[PDB]
Coordinates of C-alpha atoms and ligand atoms in Angstrom, one line a residue:
Chain A
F725 CA 80.3 109.9 107.8
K726 CA 81.4 112.3 105.0
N727 CA 82.3 112.1 101.3
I728 CA 84.5 115.0 100.3
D729 CA 87.5 115.0 97.9
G730 CA 87.1 111.2 97.6
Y731 CA 88.1 110.6 101.3
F732 CA 85.4 108.8 103.3
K733 CA 86.3 110.2 106.7
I734 CA 84.6 108.5 109.6
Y735 CA 84.4 110.3 112.9
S736 CA 83.3 108.6 116.1
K737 CA 83.5 108.8 119.9
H738 CA 82.1 106.5 122.6
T739 CA 80.5 108.4 125.4
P740 CA 78.9 106.6 128.4
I741 CA 75.5 107.5 129.8
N742 CA 73.8 107.2 133.2
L743 CA 70.1 107.1 132.6
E744 CA 67.6 107.1 129.7
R745 CA 69.0 109.0 126.7
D746 CA 67.3 111.7 124.6
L747 CA 70.5 113.3 123.3
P748 CA 71.2 114.5 126.8
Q749 CA 72.5 118.0 127.8
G750 CA 76.1 117.3 127.3
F751 CA 79.0 118.2 125.0
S752 CA 81.5 115.8 123.4
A753 CA 83.8 115.9 120.5
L754 CA 84.2 113.2 117.8
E755 CA 87.7 112.0 116.8
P756 CA 88.6 110.8 113.3
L757 CA 88.7 107.0 113.0
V758 CA 89.5 106.2 109.4
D759 CA 90.3 108.0 106.1
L760 CA 89.3 105.4 103.5
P761 CA 90.5 106.9 100.1
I762 CA 87.9 105.2 97.8
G763 CA 85.9 108.1 96.3
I764 CA 82.6 106.1 96.1
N765 CA 79.4 107.8 95.1
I766 CA 77.4 107.3 98.3
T767 CA 73.8 108.6 98.2
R768 CA 72.0 105.8 100.1
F769 CA 72.8 103.9 103.3
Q770 CA 71.1 101.3 105.5
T771 CA 71.9 100.4 109.1
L772 CA 73.0 96.7 109.2
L773 CA 71.6 94.6 112.0
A774 CA 72.3 91.1 113.3
Chain B
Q1187 CA 99.0 83.0 64.8
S1188 CA 101.9 81.3 66.4
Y1189 CA 105.3 82.9 67.0
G1190 CA 108.5 80.9 66.1
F1191 CA 111.1 82.7 68.2
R1192 CA 114.0 80.6 67.2
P1193 CA 117.4 81.8 68.5
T1194 CA 118.6 82.4 64.9
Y1195 CA 115.8 84.9 64.0
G1196 CA 116.7 88.3 62.9
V1197 CA 116.6 91.3 65.3
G1198 CA 113.3 92.4 63.7
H1199 CA 111.8 89.0 64.7
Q1200 CA 113.5 88.4 68.0
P1201 CA 111.2 88.4 71.0
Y1202 CA 111.0 91.5 73.2
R1203 CA 109.5 91.5 76.7
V1204 CA 107.5 94.7 76.9
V1205 CA 106.3 96.0 80.3
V1206 CA 103.9 99.0 80.3
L1207 CA 103.4 101.1 83.4
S1208 CA 99.9 102.5 83.6
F1209 CA 99.2 105.5 85.9
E1210 CA 95.7 106.7 86.8
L1211 CA 94.8 110.2 88.1
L1212 CA 91.1 109.7 88.9
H1213 CA 89.2 111.8 91.5
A1214 CA 90.2 109.5 94.4
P1215 CA 93.7 110.3 95.8
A1216 CA 95.3 107.7 97.9
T1217 CA 98.7 106.9 99.4
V1218 CA 100.1 105.3 96.2
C1219 CA 103.4 107.3 95.9
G1220 CA 107.1 106.7 95.6
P1221 CA 109.7 106.2 98.3
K1222 CA 111.0 109.2 100.3
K1223 CA 114.4 109.6 101.9
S1224 CA 114.6 109.6 105.7
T1225 CA 117.3 111.2 107.8
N1226 CA 118.3 111.7 111.5
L1227 CA 116.7 114.3 113.8
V1228 CA 118.9 117.3 114.4
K1229 CA 118.5 120.3 116.8
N1230 CA 120.9 122.5 118.8
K1231 CA 121.7 125.1 116.1
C1232 CA 118.5 124.3 114.2
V1233 CA 118.9 122.8 110.7
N1234 CA 116.2 122.9 108.0
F1235 CA 113.6 120.1 108.4
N1236 CA 111.0 118.7 106.1
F1237 CA 108.8 116.6 108.4
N1238 CA 106.1 114.7 106.4
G1239 CA 105.7 117.5 103.9
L1240 CA 105.9 120.7 105.9
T1241 CA 109.2 122.7 106.1
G1242 CA 110.4 124.8 108.9
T1243 CA 113.5 126.1 110.7
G1244 CA 112.8 126.2 114.4
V1245 CA 114.6 124.6 117.3
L1246 CA 113.4 121.0 117.7
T1247 CA 112.9 120.2 121.4
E1248 CA 111.4 117.5 123.6
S1249 CA 108.9 119.7 125.4
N1250 CA 105.9 118.3 127.2
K1251 CA 103.4 119.9 124.8
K1252 CA 101.6 116.6 124.3
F1253 CA 99.3 116.5 121.3
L1254 CA 96.5 114.0 120.7
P1255 CA 97.3 110.5 119.4
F1256 CA 95.6 111.4 116.1
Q1257 CA 96.8 115.0 115.5
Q1258 CA 99.9 115.5 113.2
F1259 CA 100.4 119.2 113.3
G1260 CA 100.8 122.2 115.6
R1261 CA 99.5 125.8 115.3
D1262 CA 99.5 128.7 117.8
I1263 CA 97.0 131.7 118.0
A1264 CA 98.9 133.3 115.1
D1265 CA 98.5 130.1 113.0
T1266 CA 102.2 129.6 113.3
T1267 CA 103.3 126.2 111.9
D1268 CA 104.6 124.5 115.1
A1269 CA 106.6 121.3 114.9
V1270 CA 105.0 117.9 114.4
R1271 CA 105.6 114.7 116.3
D1272 CA 108.2 112.4 114.8
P1273 CA 106.6 110.4 111.9
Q1274 CA 108.8 107.4 113.0
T1275 CA 109.3 107.4 116.8
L1276 CA 106.1 109.4 117.6
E1277 CA 108.1 111.6 119.8
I1278 CA 106.4 115.0 120.5
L1279 CA 108.4 118.0 119.3
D1280 CA 108.2 121.8 119.3
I1281 CA 109.9 124.6 117.4
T1282 CA 110.7 128.3 118.2
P1283 CA 112.5 131.0 116.2
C1284 CA 116.2 130.4 116.1
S1285 CA 117.5 133.8 117.4
Chain C
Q1414 CA 67.8 84.5 100.4
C1415 CA 67.1 87.3 102.8
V1416 CA 63.8 87.7 104.7
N1417 CA 62.0 91.0 104.7
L1418 CA 60.8 91.5 108.2
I1419 CA 63.0 94.4 109.6
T1420 CA 61.1 97.3 108.0
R1421 CA 59.2 99.5 110.5
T1422 CA 58.0 103.1 110.9
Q1423 CA 60.0 106.2 111.9
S1424 CA 59.8 108.8 114.7
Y1425 CA 61.4 112.1 115.7
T1426 CA 63.1 113.5 118.8
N1427 CA 64.8 116.7 120.0
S1428 CA 68.6 116.7 119.8
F1429 CA 71.3 118.8 121.5
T1430 CA 74.8 120.1 120.8
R1431 CA 75.9 116.8 119.2
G1432 CA 78.0 116.0 116.1
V1433 CA 81.0 118.2 116.9
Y1434 CA 84.2 116.7 115.5
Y1435 CA 87.7 117.8 114.8
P1436 CA 87.8 119.3 111.3
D1437 CA 91.6 118.9 111.0
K1438 CA 94.4 116.8 112.5
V1439 CA 96.1 119.8 114.1
Ligands
LIG2069 C1 79.4 110.1 90.7 O1 78.2 110.8 90.3 C2 78.5 111.9 89.5 C3 77.2 112.6 89.2 O2 76.1 112.0 90.0 C4 79.2 111.5 88.2 O3 79.4 112.6 87.4 C5 80.5 113.4 87.9 O4 79.9 114.6 88.6 C6 80.9 115.5 89.2 C7 80.2 116.6 89.8 O5 78.8 116.6 89.4 C8 81.9 116.0 88.1 O6 82.9 116.7 88.7 C9 82.5 114.8 87.4 O7 83.3 115.2 86.3 C10 81.4 113.9 86.8 N1 82.0 112.7 86.2 C11 81.7 112.3 84.9 C12 82.4 111.1 84.4 O8 80.9 112.9 84.2 C13 80.4 110.7 88.5 O9 81.0 110.2 87.3 C14 80.2 109.6 89.4 N2 81.4 108.8 89.8 C15 82.4 109.4 90.4 C16 83.6 108.5 90.7 O10 82.4 110.6 90.8
LIG2070 C1 95.2 118.0 130.2 O1 94.5 118.2 131.3 C2 94.9 117.4 132.4 C3 94.0 117.6 133.6 O2 94.2 118.8 134.3 C4 96.4 117.8 132.8 O3 96.8 116.9 133.8 C5 97.4 117.7 134.9 O4 98.7 118.2 134.5 C6 99.3 119.0 135.6 C7 100.5 119.6 135.0 O5 101.5 118.6 134.9 C8 99.5 118.1 136.8 O6 100.0 119.0 137.9 C9 98.2 117.5 137.3 O7 98.4 116.6 138.3 C10 97.5 116.7 136.1 N1 96.3 116.2 136.5 C11 95.9 114.9 136.3 C12 94.6 114.5 136.8 O8 96.7 114.1 135.7 C13 97.3 117.7 131.6 O9 98.6 118.2 131.9 C14 96.7 118.5 130.4 N2 97.5 118.3 129.2 C15 98.5 119.2 128.9 C16 99.2 118.9 127.6 O10 98.7 120.1 129.6
LIG2071 C1 110.9 102.4 112.0 O1 112.0 101.5 112.1 C2 112.9 101.7 113.3 C3 114.1 100.8 113.2 O2 113.6 99.4 113.2 C4 112.1 101.5 114.6 O3 112.9 101.9 115.7 C5 112.8 100.8 116.6 O4 111.7 100.9 117.5 C6 111.6 99.8 118.4 C7 110.3 100.1 119.2 O5 109.2 99.7 118.5 C8 112.8 99.8 119.3 O6 112.7 98.7 120.2 C9 114.1 99.7 118.5 O7 115.2 99.8 119.3 C10 114.1 100.8 117.4 N1 115.3 100.6 116.6 C11 116.0 101.7 116.2 C12 117.2 101.3 115.3 O8 115.8 102.8 116.5 C13 110.8 102.4 114.5 O9 110.0 102.1 115.7 C14 110.0 102.2 113.3 N2 108.9 103.1 113.2 C15 107.7 102.7 112.7 C16 106.6 103.8 112.8 O10 107.5 101.6 112.3
NAG2072 C1 60.7 117.0 113.2 O1 59.9 116.8 112.0 C2 58.7 116.1 112.1 C3 58.1 115.9 110.8 O2 58.8 116.8 109.8 C4 57.8 116.8 113.1 O3 56.6 116.1 113.3 C5 58.5 117.1 114.4 O4 57.7 117.9 115.3 C6 59.8 117.8 114.2 N1 60.6 117.9 115.5 C7 60.6 119.1 116.1 C8 61.4 119.1 117.4 O5 60.0 120.1 115.7

């Protein structure tokens, strides 16, 4: 997540794993998902659970 | 105070519907713009093209230089502004100098 | 209305070459 020039650009990429993960020794690029043009002052965030 | 607005009132007292258009230029640009004119794709003796903002002169072609489904540009090693896919039909394009 | 029971401590771990994204749509 980024906040630059008002655009809240979200980058994401789903990558499958094979065993236990510890940020494994692999490379993968993230593709842009949305470009919400809101320009909100974002200084805090909380992960929402269900 | 109440308005009368009888049909025989003078021009100075007749009702006027006033519509004010307010425009904001805050630090949050969005896609709120006016309408743009659209034309037909032309190649084969290249004509000038203005595709989604950028302007070029190359030969539009249907080459197999497939881009990504999110990219909307094209640049070579020399940062040459290659053609962009069709903003309407999503058809991949490419340009070269026109001799 | 909410119930405060999700708070818990933190930890740390070693990452790798992650977070690389496309800086432009070209
Ligand atoms: C967001 O927060 C900033 C500061 O925390 C507010 O002040 C702006 O700060 C930036 C950079 O420091 C300046 O370029 C702006 O001119 C400042 N704005 C004002 C009104 O002083 C800012 O107002 C807050 N809101 C937004 C939408 O940016
Ligand atoms: C992206 O990479 C894939 C994987 O090599 C390319 O797919 C191959 O393309 C060649 C050329 O047409 C074919 O001979 C192979 O059979 C293709 N392989 C597979 C598994 O489909 C693909 O062409 C590359 N993308 C571009 C734009 O060149
Ligand atoms: C813009 O409008 C044109 C015209 O309706 C669309 O072209 C049609 O595309 C469909 C496929 O989705 C075809 O089945 C029709 O035959 C096309 N019609 C014509 C006249 O070409 C075009 O797809 C639209 N583009 C977007 C991005 O909405
Ligand atoms: C990350 O930071 C924490 C506390 O600052 C530290 O305990 C931990 O060792 C650090 N991780 C690495 C890999 O150094």
